[PDB]
């Protein structure tokens, strides 16, 4: 749990962070879906618990620089990423 | 001067009331927000 891993819940391919969830599934319901109709919460087949299944951190790397005619130092910005995730 | 000042004050109070009561006064900004949201939602839904 809490690690970017490849998860398999009865042939369910995917990759993401498996975190405990507070949602309340119905007994027959196996895996949930979000507004986008994508896999969001999955119930473990062996032990019955509700787990969120977010995807791993992604973003966009932007580079801040003065002109090379001035200097070669750059600063890198990771868009939409908490500083503890790099 | 006093009449004009009183008229201005009353008008500005009525402006606040009219903005507070009528819901469709700010339709343009809400349309902007809704258009952006629905475009993103449609593009996401196209994945399925």
């Amino acid at each position: 749990k809490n690690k970017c891993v490849n998860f398999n819940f009865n042939g369910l391919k995917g990759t993401g962070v498996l975190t405990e969830s507070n949602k309340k599934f119905l007994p027959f319901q196996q895996f949930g879906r979000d507004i986008a109709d994508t896999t969001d919460a999955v119930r473990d087949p062996q032990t019955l618990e509700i787990l969120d299944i977010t995807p791993c951190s992604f973003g966009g790397v932007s580079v801040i620089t003065p002109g090379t005619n001035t200097s070669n130092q750059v600063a890198v910005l990771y868009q939409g990423v908490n500083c503890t995730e790099v | 001067q006093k009449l004009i000042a009183n008229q201005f004050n009353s008008a500005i109070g009525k402006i606040q009331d009219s903005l507070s009561s009528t819901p469709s006064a700010l339709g343009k900004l809400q349309d902007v927000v809704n258009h952006n949201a629905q475009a993103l939602n449609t593009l996401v839904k196209q994945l399925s």
């Binding site: 992604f58 973003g59 939409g80 | 903005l19 700010l26 900004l29 809400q30 927000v33 996401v44």
Partner: peptide, 20 residues
């Protein structure tokens, strides 16, 4: 008050405090 993946939303350069 009256106004309410692979896709990212970028923040505006001017915060609402600066506009105010």
């Amino acid at each position: 008050n009256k106004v309410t993946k692979g896709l990212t939303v970028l923040p505006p350069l001017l915060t609402d405090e600066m506009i105010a």
